[PDB]
Amino acid sequence: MKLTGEVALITGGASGLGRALVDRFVAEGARVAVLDKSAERLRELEVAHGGNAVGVVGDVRSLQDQKRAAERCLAAFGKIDTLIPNAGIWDYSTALADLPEDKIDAAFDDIFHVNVKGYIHAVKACLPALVSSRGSVVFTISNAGFYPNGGGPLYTATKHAVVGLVRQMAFELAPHVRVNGVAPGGMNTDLRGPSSLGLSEQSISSVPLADMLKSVLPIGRMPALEEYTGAYVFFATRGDSLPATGALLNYDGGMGVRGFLTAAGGADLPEKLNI
Amino acid sequence: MKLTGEVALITGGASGLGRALVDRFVAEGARVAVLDKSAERLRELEVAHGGNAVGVVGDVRSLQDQKRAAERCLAAFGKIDTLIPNAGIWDYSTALADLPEDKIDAAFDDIFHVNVKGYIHAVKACLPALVSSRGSVVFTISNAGFYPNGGGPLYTATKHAVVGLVRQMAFELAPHVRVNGVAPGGMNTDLRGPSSLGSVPLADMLKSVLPIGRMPALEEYTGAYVFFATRGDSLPATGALLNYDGGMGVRGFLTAAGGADLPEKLNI
Amino acid sequence: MKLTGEVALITGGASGLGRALVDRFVAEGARVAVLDKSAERLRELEVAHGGNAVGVVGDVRSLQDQKRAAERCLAAFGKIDTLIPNAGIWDYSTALADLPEDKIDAAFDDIFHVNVKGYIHAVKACLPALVSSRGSVVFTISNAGFYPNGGGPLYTATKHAVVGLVRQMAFELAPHVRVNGVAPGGMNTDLRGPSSLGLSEQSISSVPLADMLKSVLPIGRMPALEEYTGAYVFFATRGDSLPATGALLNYDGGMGVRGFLTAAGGADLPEKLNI
Amino acid sequence: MKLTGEVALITGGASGLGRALVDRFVAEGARVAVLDKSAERLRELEVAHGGNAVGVVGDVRSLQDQKRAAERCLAAFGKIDTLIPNAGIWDYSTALADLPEDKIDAAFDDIFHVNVKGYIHAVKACLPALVSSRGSVVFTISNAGFYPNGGGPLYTATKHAVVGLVRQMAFELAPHVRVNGVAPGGMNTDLRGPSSLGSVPLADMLKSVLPIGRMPALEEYTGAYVFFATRGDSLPATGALLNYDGGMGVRGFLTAAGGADLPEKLNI
Ligand SMILES: NC(=O)c1ccc[n+]([C@@H]2O[C@H](COP(=O)([O-])OP(=O)(O)OC[C@H]3O[C@@H](n4cnc5c(N)ncnc54)[C@H](O)[C@@H]3O)[C@@H](O)[C@H]2O)c1
Ligand SMILES: NC(=O)c1ccc[n+]([C@@H]2O[C@H](COP(=O)([O-])OP(=O)(O)OC[C@H]3O[C@@H](n4cnc5c(N)ncnc54)[C@H](O)[C@@H]3O)[C@@H](O)[C@H]2O)c1
Ligand SMILES: NC(=O)c1ccc[n+]([C@@H]2O[C@H](COP(=O)([O-])OP(=O)(O)OC[C@H]3O[C@@H](n4cnc5c(N)ncnc54)[C@H](O)[C@@H]3O)[C@@H](O)[C@H]2O)c1
Ligand SMILES: NC(=O)c1ccc[n+]([C@@H]2O[C@H](COP(=O)([O-])OP(=O)(O)OC[C@H]3O[C@@H](n4cnc5c(N)ncnc54)[C@H](O)[C@@H]3O)[C@@H](O)[C@H]2O)c1
Ligand SMILES: Oc1cccc(-c2ccccc2)c1O
Ligand SMILES: Oc1cccc(-c2ccccc2)c1O
């Protein structure tokens, strides 16, 4: 186990990547606290992992719930080694032109409150525990944090913003707490949009992501959620990622190195070297 | 005069970088519309520039006030060629540890509303006019949009966030409207912060910070904007990011600059 | 004139972008020295510009010729305000698999000698004059200096390398000489490949660049060479670019902000806002 | 043991970062082939690791020596899963002003030949085996591949150049072979330079330089490579760049780190 005796706090861990993360982290010897708004799914993750997992119902936008999550984690486990702010909301790539005027201000607050403020409240709440442990923060970014076309202006703005927290928090929490970001590509999760845009109940699993991403990713397929948890274990392992603070790992099937006419340069290499 | 017949709309153009831009765009033969919250400072630029300026007293956070900036720019001048969303707010470099739990929620909103939403509203408000003139957007960023230590978590994330609007608005507004970002640093503007809040001077730390070894006057930050607003010079450029901070990101570990003793070394 | 009384030295200025640059710079009040290997084209540029242009035959790979170019510039004009290293060679995007083993080492030296060493020798030679003038260096990069698919490993490596000289030379020549890079996209020039690859006599003007780039650039067309000179005037104007050292201006029709399924997001905006 | 059944080929794996990698990959259950110019140091790792290593004494600049590294890795172990081109040469941070006109031409070649061509030859030599195992390449970069002041013009351009091989080889070797770069800094390796040449210590400047506030042992730089060579953990990642330098690019203007007084501030 890369991670025996380590203690993680993960927000948005009752679905999608945050759940796979929880599963992975427990399989690696860690004990995990989850702050999520989803009551039933938090209990589902608790009964799956038998004491190695604590689940706290609450909102990432409330510092208080976040503080509660920290407190419960400390009460359940003794410490926090790794903070993984992760809970998130999409805009479904609604362009600026298509953001209705009566809806922009509300959509703005909703997406930024979860995506950016939710991250800031995770760090504020866990700060005393992370300095105590010399632990580390790993933020879930996205390809939308580096290149356009992965979300509308709201969402691309929020992910670019977390890159800004990666850097500012690596600076500010040094030398006691390390700060890094993982930037996953498309995932088959239960990612939702905001009420403003009537996307509360739209789920990204309902979008033909696997179909689309086959054409676009150099690596010629969308990874399974299992395969997006590895990078987080890396940053959560003391002995492996000690020299990394400030790090931005693009973890997206190579969206930033794709070609202009094809995603991949070497589909026919095996036969070009004729094996 | 590089911009004769061109019309700009500049938000936060009544003080600091924004005033220097008004003056410069007006001196280049451009006519300028200005949305600023400072009515008295809007007065002064209106007297300064005759009919070559119009101010609208509004808040960059209000989409409607933004609409009136645009519409009044259209009524005065007939078009908008270049939009410079520029209004912004700083956090005094307040470290997360030092943001009070009871202030953090409002202060997040105040800073992100002006700095980010404000930029979004300015574009949204100017979209039909820009697409019509096939114009250009130049957002003002900051060194804090790329490197730590130019603001706390709130400011830095706001300025990283606008790096994102550059790229996504470049993509989205193409092929009609070009979108770029200028990232100034090294200024000593009277950049203030929100009510929510009540950091050693740039002079005190310049040798560890600015390879250029000097503090440029505001007027020296105007040229990049003129360039990105000149269609005959900046046409290839959309999505671009111009670090304009005196070399902050190319500074040395022990000193900002490494060739202080060049003239004496090269016998100059 | 943005540039009255200014003095430029441009390498590779007898063809393609370097020529347009020369033309532009003279139209802007500047006097221009050109180091190029092309004898006849250097004389052609001299007779076009009547005293405002000096041309020196020589190779960018020889420090000596480069020194000669500096000397001639000083003799002709009195000073050097702006150094524009620019001469270059392409690999035509020959993939690693297609670089023959008997040819890699020679192709390596040729492309790196021109693309990177040629730049280093321009700066070494003009250094005394640029400190004297407090002038500035502007390197011609490329999109191949930022993203793949604009050249093979050799060429993408050389352009990434000049990004490295942008940064190291902005640092090292501060506070007396500013250092910046412009990174143009595809251009209809007379860009050649190396002898090793039998590309000496292949010209990029013979590649359907305009056709290809129509699909790929957000801006929906390849710019004319006239329209790639503006950025250089910006960096060559004292009063406009004084706070820029270290700067990297992507100047390529928006290759880094293109979409996954289309280059541009807003082909049908006029009708979306219905004008 | 994270890499049981996996085979790596590591160039410059007989000292510094490369030796730490050999040891670490061997301790993870991997079998390792090593191309290094240092025959005596190749001896020591051969005795250190029993049959779990093989060295070939060669030069990373020679395509043929590279071919024998690969082929001998195949004869010994049957496959290559992970190639770590890692051999490199520094310039002592020799400033351009200080590169002698008579040395500059050779020194350009020596440094670029090992550092860049060497990386190219290693991949080229290992291409049929990597594509066959659907493996991965991890080039060693450097802080000098991103920020100034970790080498003169020659070194820095060499390490920026490898950032380019990452992206172009990611593109070109896809979808079969993933290519990433690790960029270490903050080490105190015995990094030497070319004959052509005959810079204050990291200890002397650490507080302006490393937010982590400490000098990590070599062994602490191995984990990222293990990660990028573990197919079940690093599969999404191709073209990636992992800054692994203690936070050099996220350091402050006046001090590297900004929360030195956190424990006392948070009452820890
Ligand atoms: N899914 C993708 O394509 C993708 C790609 C890149 C990055 N990301 C990022 O991955 C992260 C995880 O999202 P996901 O993709 O697993 O979607 P998901 O909806 O399946 O998981 C996100 C979790 O966030 C929780 N959550 C949302 N708002 C909350 C709130 N206000 N308070 C408490 N909990 C809240 C939800 O209950 C859910 O369990 C987000 O940061 C997302 O932007 C997603
Ligand atoms: N200080 C630096 O070195 C530095 C560096 C990079 C970028 N900047 C940026 O430069 C841009 C211009 O600011 P400045 O530095 O010139 O500071 P400034 O305060 O002198 O100028 C800001 C202007 O914006 C106006 N403004 C502020 N909030 C507003 C609102 N809500 N609605 C309407 N108008 C509003 C102010 O009244 C003022 O006229 C900002 O985006 C700032 O973030 C400053
Ligand atoms: N053309 C493109 O698509 C493109 C795109 C981005 C960047 N660039 C860069 O633009 C620059 C200019 O090249 P171009 O596109 O105008 O091609 P070009 O061949 O038309 O111009 C380049 C000039 O370099 C000169 N030159 C080449 N080798 C030389 C040597 N060893 N010594 C002296 N002079 C030499 C040639 O004579 C020629 O006049 C290069 O740095 C190139 O990589 C080109
Ligand atoms: N010093 C730092 O902080 C730092 C930072 C980032 C990256 N690096 C890089 O780490 C990598 C490993 O180097 P190191 O720092 O461990 O230094 P090192 O000298 O201790 O290791 C280099 C190894 O490469 C071998 N080598 C050198 N030239 C060779 C050649 N031409 N052919 C074959 N083998 C050759 C040497 O014999 C030695 O075993 C290099 O790419 C170096 O550039 C060092
Ligand atoms: O972070 C993200 C979250 C959700 C979707 C995407 C996405 C990207 C490209 C195409 C379609 C969706 C994304 O990047
Ligand atoms: O710098 C460059 C020089 C020559 C060609 C390209 C290019 C890029 C994309 C597609 C085709 C050619 C390039 O980027």
DSSP string, A207-248: S-HHHHHHHH-TTSSPPPGGGGSHHHHHHH-HHHHTT-SS-E
At residue D232, φ and ψ (nearest 5 deg) are -75, -15
Task: Name the DSSP class of D14.
Answer: S
Q: For tokens 């399989």, what's the residue?
A: A27
Q: Which atom of ligand 1 is nearest to the CA of A61?
A: 31
Q: Which residues are CB-neighbours of A168 under 8 A, at least 6 positions away?
A: B148, B149, B151, B152, B153, B156, B157
C157–D165 C-beta distance less than 8 A:
yes
Q: Which residues are CB-neighbours of B206 under 8 A, at least 6 positions away?
A: B213, B215, B256
Cα–Cα distance for residue pair C242/B47, rounded to 1 Å: 30
A188 and A222 Cβ atoms separated by less than 8 Å: yes
> Domains in chain D, ordered, with CATH?
1-268 (3.40.50.720)
- What resolution in angstroms does the PDB record give? 2.4
Tokens of A202: 């739209």
CA dihedral D74, D76, D79, D84 (to 10 degrees): -80
Q: Are strands D82-84 and D7-11 parallel, antiparallel or unpaired?
A: parallel
D181 and D168 Cβ atoms separated by less than 8 Å: no
Q: Which atom of ligand 1 is nearest to the CA of A18?
A: 16
For residue C171, the chain B residues in CB contact (below 8 A) are 211, 247, 250-252, 257-258
Active site residues of A: 155
Task: Name the DSSP class of D58.
Answer: -
Cα–Cα distance for residue pair D171/B127, rounded to 1 Å: 36
Residue (of D137, D157, D131) closest to D145 by Cα position: D157
Please tell me whether D186 is known to bind a ligand: no
Burial, C198: exposed, middle or buried (Cβ in 10 Å; 0-12, 13-18, 19+)?
Answer: exposed
Tokens of C59: 């190779």
Choose the residue to mutate in D189, D190, D210, D225 for probing ligand 4, maximizing ligand atoms within 8 Å of C-beta: D189
Q: Which of residues 213-242 of C touch A (CB under 8 A)?
A: 215-216
Cα–Cα distance for residue pair D152/D142, rounded to 1 Å: 13
- Measured in Å, residue A57 CA sits from the centre of ligand 1 at 15
Q: Which atom of ligand 4 is nearest to the CA of D90?
A: 43
The angle that helices D118-133 and C101-112 make with each other, rounded to 10 degrees, is: 140
Query: How far is C-alpha C70 from the chain's CA centre?
Result: 18
At residue A163, φ and ψ (nearest 5 deg) are -55, -40
Cα–Cα distance for residue pair A219/A85, rounded to 1 Å: 27
Task: Name the DSSP class of A193.
Answer: -
D159–C158 C-beta distance less than 8 A:
no
C178 and B212 Cβ atoms separated by less than 8 Å: yes
A115 and A163 Cβ atoms separated by less than 8 Å: no
Q: Which of residues 185-204 of D touch C (CB under 8 A)?
A: none
B9 and B83 Cβ atoms separated by less than 8 Å: yes
For residue C175, the chain B residues in CB contact (below 8 A) are 211-214, 257, 259-260
Backbone region of residue C37 per phi and psi (left: phi > 0; alpha: psi in -120 to 50; beta: other values): alpha
- Measured in Å, residue A232 CA sits from the centre of ligand 1 at 15
Residue (of D32, D25, D34) closest to D1 by Cα position: D25
Residue C13 CB neighbours (<10 A): 30
Cα–Cα distance for residue pair C184/C168, rounded to 1 Å: 21
Burial, B264: exposed, middle or buried (Cβ in 10 Å; 0-12, 13-18, 19+)?
Answer: exposed
A152 and A106 Cβ atoms separated by less than 8 Å: no
Question: DSSP assignment of chain B, as one string?
Answer: -TTTT-EEEEET-SSHHHHHHHHHHHHTT-EEEEEES-HHHHHHHHHHTGGGEEEEE--TT-HHHHHHHHHHHHHHHS---EEE-------TT--GGGS-TTTHHHHHHHHHIIIIIHHHHHHHHHHHHHHHHT-EEEEE--GGGTSSSSS-HHHHHHHHHHHHHHHHHHHHHTTTSEEEEEEE-S--------TT-----TGGGGGGT-TT-S---GGGGSHHHHHHH-HHHHTT-SS-EEEESSSGGG--SS-S-S-TTHHHHTT-
Q: Are strands C31-36 and C7-11 parallel, antiparallel or unpaired?
A: parallel
Measured between CB atoms, which of A148, A266, A272 is closest to C259? Answer: A148
Residue D229 vs residues A212, C99, C139, D81, D236: alpha-carbon distances, Å: 27, 26, 37, 8, 12
B148–D251 C-beta distance less than 8 A:
yes
In the set B155, B221, B225, B244, the catalytic residue is: B155
Residue (of A30, C27, D108) closest to B232 by Cα position: C27
| Residues in a beta bridge with A31 | A7
Q: Tell whether ligand 1 has an atom less than 6 A from the beta carbon of residue A253.
A: no
Residue B162 vs residues A145, B127, B169, B174: alpha-carbon distances, Å: 11, 17, 10, 18
Cα–Cα distance for residue pair D268/D261, rounded to 1 Å: 10
Q: Tell whether ligand 1 has an atom less than 6 A from the beta carbon of residue A140.
A: yes
D81 and D138 Cβ atoms separated by less than 8 Å: no
Buried-exposed string A160-197: b where 16+ CB fall within 10 A, e elsewhere: bbbbbbbbbbbbbbbbbbbbbbbbbbbbbbebbbbebb
B46 and B53 Cβ atoms separated by less than 8 Å: yes
Residue (of B58, B67, B64, B107) closest to B87 by Cα position: B58
Cα–Cα distance for residue pair D29/D200, rounded to 1 Å: 39
| Whether A259 contacts chain C with CB within 8 A | yes
Question: DSSP assignment of B20-49, as one string?
Answer: HHHHHHHHTT-EEEEEES-HHHHHHHHHHT
Residue (of B153, B154, B222, B157) closest to B187 by Cα position: B222
Tokens of A259: 């070609």
At residue C138, φ and ψ (nearest 5 deg) are -125, 110
Return the SS3 of C117. Answer: helix
Residue bearing the CA closest to ligand 3, atom 6: C142
| Whether A176 contacts chain D with CB within 8 A | yes
Measured between CB atoms, which of C243, C264, C275 is closest to B174? Answer: C264
Rounded to the nearest angstrom, the minimum Cα separation between B29 and chain C is 15
Q: Which atom of ligand 6 is nearest to the CA of C213?
A: 10
For residue C257, the chain A residues in CB contact (below 8 A) are 147-148
Residue C116 vs residues B214, C121, C163, D107: alpha-carbon distances, Å: 30, 9, 10, 13
Residue (of D138, D118, A161) closest to B155 by Cα position: A161
Cα–Cα distance for residue pair D19/D34, rounded to 1 Å: 9
Cα–Cα distance for residue pair C18/A11, rounded to 1 Å: 54
C52 and C102 Cβ atoms separated by less than 8 Å: no
Task: Output the CA angle A44-A45-A50, nearest 5 degrees.
Answer: 105
Q: For tokens 């790539």, what's the residue?
A: A93
At residue D159, φ and ψ (nearest 5 deg) are -85, -30
